């Protein structure tokens, strides 16, 4: 034997291992395999997938940002050889980043979301938020008509997740808060619409505070963590209003 070890429990176990080894590429590949068996994912399994791909794409976002920024001070100095080199390397990272994004998005469209029964609202929301996140990540690096298309695709997923979460999930649920958090960020960073960003973040925070009275001590730690971030963002976004 030698890691041609393929049955479902084994794969999830490899994913867990890989995660502790911080080998997210391996982790993503395992969870992709689990997903492709076409059965639903447990809560733990969902998060393993989410975590793998978030880390994989996140390394490339982080790289992309450092190089995009170097490209902007560099172009001001006007050196052809360097301007080309940087451009090319930024592109190289872009293509990696997009490939990962399709990989996930394909799993979402063709396995995870598809196989949600009408009343599995929690899963459908998780997966739609995820879909919005990854189309958002594409938007960070897109330009022109390509950008416009994926921005639309992000809005549709984040919007549908919002409707579903508003009706069938309570305002303190970590997933509904996380959605509000990321959807608010989508508004601020991609749509460049600060007033919506803030409204959404504020509304979702206030709605959570209302029900905060009677939260279990288990879920209380989970929700407040996310509610902090909502607030931190809001504070940041309203500490540079019209001055």
């Amino acid at each position: 034997a030698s890691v041609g070890l393929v049955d479902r429990e084994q794969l999830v176990q490899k994913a867990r291992l890989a995660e502790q080894a911080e080998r997210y590429d391996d982790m993503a590949a395992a969870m992709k395999n689990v997903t492709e068996l076409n059965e639903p994912l447990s809560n733990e399994e969902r998060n393993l997938l989410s975590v793998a791909y978030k880390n994989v794409v996140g390394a490339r976002r982080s790289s992309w940002r450092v190089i995009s920024s170097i490209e902007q001070k560099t172009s001001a100095d006007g050196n052809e050889k360097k301007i080309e080199m940087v451009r090319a390397y930024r592109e190289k990272i872009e293509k990696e980043l997009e490939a990962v994004c399709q990989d996930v998005l394909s799993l979402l469209d063709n396995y995870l979301i598809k196989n949600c029964s009408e009343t599995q609202y929690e899963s459908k929301v998780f997966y739609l938020k995820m879909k919005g996140d990854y189309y958002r990540y594409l938007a960070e690096v897109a330009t022109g008509e390509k950008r416009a298309t994926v921005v639309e695709s992000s809005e549709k997923a984040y919007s549908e997740a919002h409707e579903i979460s508003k009706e069938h999930m309570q305002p303190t649920h970590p997933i509904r808060l996380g959605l509000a958090l990321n959807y608010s960020v989508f508004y601020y960073e991609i749509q460049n619409a600060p007033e919506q960003a803030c409204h959404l973040a504020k509304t979702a925070f206030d709605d959570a505070i209302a029900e905060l009275d009677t939260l279990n001590e288990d879920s209380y730690k989970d929700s407040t963590l996310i509610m902090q971030l909502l607030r931190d963002n809001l504070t940041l976004w309203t500490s540079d209003q019209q001055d």
């Binding site: 608010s184 601020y188 960073e189």
Partner: peptide, 9 residues
């Protein structure tokens, strides 16, 4: 500076 999206580790 930026805003923070959902965390993990």
């Amino acid at each position: 500076r930026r805003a923070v999206s959902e965390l993990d580790a």
